[PDB]
Design a protein around this ligand. Structure first.
Ligand SMILES: OC[C@H]1O[C@@H](O)[C@H](O)[C@@H](O)[C@@H]1O
Length: 222
């Protein structure tokens, strides 16, 4: 209702009690974007990005872990959000290891489809003739939900593993510890040191301005 912090500046940031918020917007001609924080668990962002190729922004909240996967007893997160209908975007968890050589994404609600097609697509090495990203694993039930798994590389060669929920949702709880354990079991990485747990929206297009409310977001690390 009343903000404890707000910014419309690209890369404006604020931190309170272990949580930080980042107004990340880059690129040739970024559109206006304003993030507001009402408290440690509740925040919002409005963004007006043009109907052009590529991700323009990732407004997000972040929480630091800094622990090896093996030392972790509990790593879960709860989200509750209100999203617009149109545009090109994906609301996602962004989980990094401390070295930033492995990125794990969990897409909870998005404008594309779980099979890798749509106006947004997961990072992927391979695409189908229709242009849909090709999943490496399908209908995987892990960490409290069913997902489609995709594999790709970022521009600096770092590995990206993306899980797209087969059923989109605007509220839920993810068991990140178990998801990372399953990814380790397929051999993508070893006893990774978990660095950051992030949550926000990657906006490709939101012409006319679109609003995203994160009414609750919390991380439980033990
Ligand atoms: O290929 C498009 C991709 O660009 C990356 O930077 C993003 O993190 C992915 O989530 C996105 O789908």
């Amino acid at each position: 209702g009343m903000p404890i912090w707000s910014s419309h500046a690209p890369y404006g940031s604020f931190s309170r009690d272990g949580y930080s918020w980042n107004n990340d917007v880059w690129g040739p001609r970024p559109g206006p974007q304003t993030i507001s924080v009402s408290g440690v668990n509740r925040w919002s962002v409005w963004s007006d990005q043009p109907n052009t190729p590529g991700i323009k922004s990732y407004p997000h909240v972040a929480f630091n872990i800094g622990k090896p996967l093996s030392s972790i007893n509990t790593l879960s997160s709860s989200f509750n959000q209100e999203v617009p209908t149109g545009g090109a975007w994906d609301v996602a968890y962004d989980i990094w290891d401390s070295s930033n050589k492995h990125e794990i994404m969990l897409w909870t609600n998005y404008t594309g489809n779980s099979d890798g097609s749509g106006n947004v697509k997961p990072i992927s090495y391979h695409y189908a003739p229709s242009g849909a990203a090709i999943p490496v694993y399908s209908n995987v039930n892990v960490g409290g939900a069913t997902w489609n798994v995709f594999e790709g590389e970022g521009p600096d060669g770092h590995k990206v593993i993306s899980l797209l929920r087969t059923s989109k949702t605007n509220s839920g709880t993810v068991d990140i510890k178990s998801i990372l354990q399953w990814i380790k079991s397929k051999g993508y990485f070893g006893d990774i040191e978990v660095g950051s747990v992030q949550y926000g929206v990657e906006i490709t297009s939101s012409p006319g301005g679109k609003n995203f409310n994160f009414n609750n977001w919390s991380v439980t690390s033990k």
